[PDB]
């Protein structure tokens, strides 16, 4: 049957974008995500979505 | 014909991509270099997470 | 009487997984579950559920 | 016929498996090493607890 016709929609993400902005690399509060290591793992730069 | 592609909704932490409140997922756009890039496809309401 | 018949649902749990990567063990806040002791009593390894 | 179990609600803690408002269980997911199984099981609106 017509009018079950198909569309198509491409997505785009990003990878391995490191925001380079020292002023960009902000929180929106003080204990947002804490750890149990003396060096946060989230100011490495990101390798995966 | 418009040369473009939407956006879906990713994110380079899965951690910030859901909120512990049994409901909505995340919504914090940067937390120290990572990111989330919400939705902005025509899927908004639809496809469900 | 029939319909009131049974029915068979079968239910899933893990019990000693340690969530390896130490990006996951993350805290959404700073005193969520504080204690007195000197090392918290939630880092180690859980063994039931 | 399917080849599949649901998890209930499950946690590795009983101090996150409730939370103090007089009403609803707890729904963070997890702690420091801890984890709460969110239900997905078809048994969401009965078996009171």
Sequence with gaps: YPLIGNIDITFIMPMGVFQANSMDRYTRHAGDFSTVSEQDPRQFPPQGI | ?49
């Design chain 2, 1 to 49: 014909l418009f040369q473009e592609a939407y956006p879906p909704l990713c994110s380079s932490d899965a951690a910030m991509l859901r909120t512990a409140h049994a409901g909505e997922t995340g919504a914090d756009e940067v937390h120290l270099a990572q990111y989330l890039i919400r939705d902005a496809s025509p899927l908004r309401g639809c496809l469900p997470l």
